[PDB]
Structure 1
Amino acid sequence: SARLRLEARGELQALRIQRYFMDAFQYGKGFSRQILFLRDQAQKRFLDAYDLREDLTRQVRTALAANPEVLGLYVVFEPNALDGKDELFVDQPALGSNDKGRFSLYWAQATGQLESESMIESELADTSSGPSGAAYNAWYTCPKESGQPCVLDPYFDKVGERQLLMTSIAFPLELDGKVIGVMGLDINLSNLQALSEQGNRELYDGVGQVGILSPAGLFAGNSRDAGLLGKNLAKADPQAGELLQLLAAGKSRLFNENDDLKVLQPLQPIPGAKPWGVLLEVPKSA
């Protein structure tokens, strides 16, 4: 019953990752609320859409710098749903406004140097397939179609002049029931790779390995290979479908394999999510 010790250690490493994502979901849940405070204060205070947009753009920047762990913060309202005056803001990026005057804002922190941008209608409608079978624009469309917050399998997006793999916690901005816009947080999958590593060393002094798996089976962290980021389980463990099927079922399993044991620890990143998972592999020696 030394299985139960690794079985236990596994639950400890999964809760480490669940805490990390939950801190972020809590942060964005507050802001998403805060956004809706500001927007309602302008309606009751009878304020200018220009004053609103300039603060909501300032507000977003300020919050991203507060969480050094978030790569970017984005707020996208539905056409004419923040101030009823998108036509008054066409092609004004410094106010979170785009090619059609829509509040589509993104601040990003690739360094503590922050850069912003307005996301044109073509980007918001990009349904390109990612490494998972998911739309590129799922950081906006998942929240809108559901009414609920969404964690996203790993995907590639351009924060500046580099292609970076990341995940996103996407939140709906509801008002009297309807989704009226979407806010979200983006996490560099290098920060989840680092959590892999960090946790592994709390795992028999890192003689083994710990990887994080997306519900699509992509690696969101591998303590042993960082080149396995954005790759299916099948690039490293075809011997996979059994694991990717059990994880979907929120089922744990210890496997007796060669000179090392192994455990899949299913985890719910954010409330209401499809199971994510930590894959342990400690040499049978330790």
Structure 2
Amino acid sequence: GLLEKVINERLVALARAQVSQIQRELEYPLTVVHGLANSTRLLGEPGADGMPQLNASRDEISALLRSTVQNNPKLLDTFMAWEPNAFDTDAAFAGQPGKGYGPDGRYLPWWYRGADGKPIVEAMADSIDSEKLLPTGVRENEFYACPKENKRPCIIDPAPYEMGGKTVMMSSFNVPIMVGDQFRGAVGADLSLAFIQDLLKRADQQLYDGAGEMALIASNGRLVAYTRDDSKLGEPAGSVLDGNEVDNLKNLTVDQPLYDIDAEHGHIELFLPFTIADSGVRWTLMLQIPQAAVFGELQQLQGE
């Protein structure tokens, strides 16, 4: 039908705007940490006098990280890990705690905000080499192993980490520190799922007057956000969504919308896969809207 087509084109356009709004949120941390990687690699790149182009101390690099946290309130944190002896001699820094160094001197700072909002630092010695499987299906060290192994940017699916006495679910945005063809380390920043969820909830309230719900699904099919119920974050979409929805989640092409009508529940399903910057990472936005909210004007024309 021609009228159905005009209504459905409105729906797709509204969904596409929700995707580009989410991309703005998710591409931002990647560009932040690209900036830090593009600066830090100058520690290892000679200049016209044969000395490093950046001769910054560890205290100065940490200042850059802390300034990132300070002036990027949307980011949960900023962190960086060097390979053993990547840019200096770790042994000179061994036995110095509370600076983000491992016990052997390896540079591993994780900067985030304490209770008063002031930045504090934790060394990632415990997680950087950990093969522990977290309950969301993510290994504890994947924020570093993935950029080390693939030598390109990595976005990690939702995972819980302990932060100042509480468990925080988060996704990390990671870039390798490359000098030539050599992996020297990686730098990253997290977004909390609570942050992404709050934004998706607010965005949903402006979509068809809030009649429906949205789900953001990571590369492993687990929920980054789910406007109906915060308790489902991190959980598999296959343990929260419909048989029909879970099937449609398998029916998707690489980057192309899937439209479906769940008559059993009287709502429209729209799945839009999308990629995050040039990282090649593909997540999915799901819109679930009551049929009456989308087709109310048709209902009104036919009703009279």
- How many angstroms apart in 2 are the aligned matches of 1:262 and 1:9? 13
- The answer (yes or no) to whether the contact 2:37–2:177 under 8 Å persists in 1 is yes
Instruction: Give the drift of 1:157.
Output: 0.8
Aligned equivalents of 1:244, 1:109: Cα separation in 2: 37
Aligned to 1:142: 146
Query: Deviations along 1:97-119, whole A, 9 cap, x unmatched?
Result: 21111001110126532210112
Q: Secondary structure at the match of 1:282?
A: strand
Corresponding residue number in structure 2 for 1:173: 177
| Contact persistence 2:99–2:122 (CA under 8 A) | no
- Given the alignment of the two structures, is residue 35 of structure 1 paired with residue 48 of structure 2, yes or no? no
Which residue of 268, 271, 281 corresponds with 2:275?
268
Match of 1:278 among 274, 281, 285: 285
Instruction: For residue 63 of structure 1, report the CA deviation from its aligned partner.
Output: 1.2
Amino acid aligned to 1:184: G
Partner SS, residue 115 of structure 1 = strand
Gaps of 5+ in 1: none
Q: Work out whether 1:207 is the aligned partner of 2:214.
A: no
Listed as ranges, the gaps of 5+ residues in structure 2 are 294-304
Structure label with greater radius of gyration? 2
Selected match of 2:259 from 249, 254, 262? 254
**Maintained 8 Å contact 1:132/1:216:** no
* Superposed displacement of residue 31, structure 1: 1.4
| Distance 1:168-1:11 versus aligned 2 partners, 3 A rule | same
Q: How many residues were matched structurally?
A: 282
**Secondary structure of the residue that 2:90 maps to in structure 1?**
coil
Instruction: Quote the offset at 1:93 in angstroms.
Output: 3.0
Structure 1 residue aligned with 2:298 = none
Contact 1:143 1:171 in 2 (8 A): yes
1:79 matched residue in structure 2: 84
**What amino acid is the match of 1:256?**
I
Summarize the Cα distance change of 1:131–1:213 in structure 2 as closer, same or farther, 3 Å threshold: farther
Counterparts of 2:205 and 2:260, CA distance in 1:
21
CA RMSD of aligned residues (A): 2.2
Report deviation, 1:223.
1.4
Q: How does 1:1-286 map to 2 (within 5 A)?
A: 1=5, 2-38=7-43, 40=45, 44=51, 52-83=57-88, 85-109=89-113, 112-120=117-125, 122-239=126-243, 240-247=245-252, 249-258=254-263, 259-286=266-293
- How far did residue 46 of structure 1 move? 9.9
Write the letter of the residue equivalent to 1:199.
Answer: A
Tell me if the contact between 1:247 and 1:277 (Cα under 8 Å) persists in the aligned partners.
Answer: no
State the AA in 2 paired with 1:191: F
**Counterpart-to-counterpart distance in 2, 1:275 and 1:132:** 18
Letter in structure 1 aligned against 2:61 = L
Q: How far apart are residue 125 of structure 1 and its match?
A: 1.3
Query: 2:42 corresponds to which letter in structure 1?
Result: F
Shift of 1:265: 1.0
> Identity over aligned residues, as a percent?
25
CA distance in 2, matches of 1:44, 1:118: 29
Distance 1:251 1:46, change over 3 A: closer
Change beyond 3 A, Cα 1:28–1:247: farther
Change in CA separation of 1:109 and 1:137 when aligned onto 2, cut-off 3 Å: same
Partners in 2 of 1:130 and 1:247 — Cα distance? 28
**Structure 1 length normalisation: TM-score?**
0.91
After TM superposition, give the deviation of residue 131 of structure 1 in Å.
Answer: 4.1
Residue 241 and residue 282 in structure 1: after superposition, are their counterparts in 2 closer, same or farther (change >3 A)? closer
Deviation at 1:274, TM superposition (A): 3.1
Cα pair distance change 1:270/1:47, threshold 3 Å = closer
Distance 1:87 1:119, change over 3 A: same
TM-score, scaled to structure 2: 0.86
How far apart, CA to CA, are the structure 2 residues paired with 1:183 and 1:226?
Answer: 29
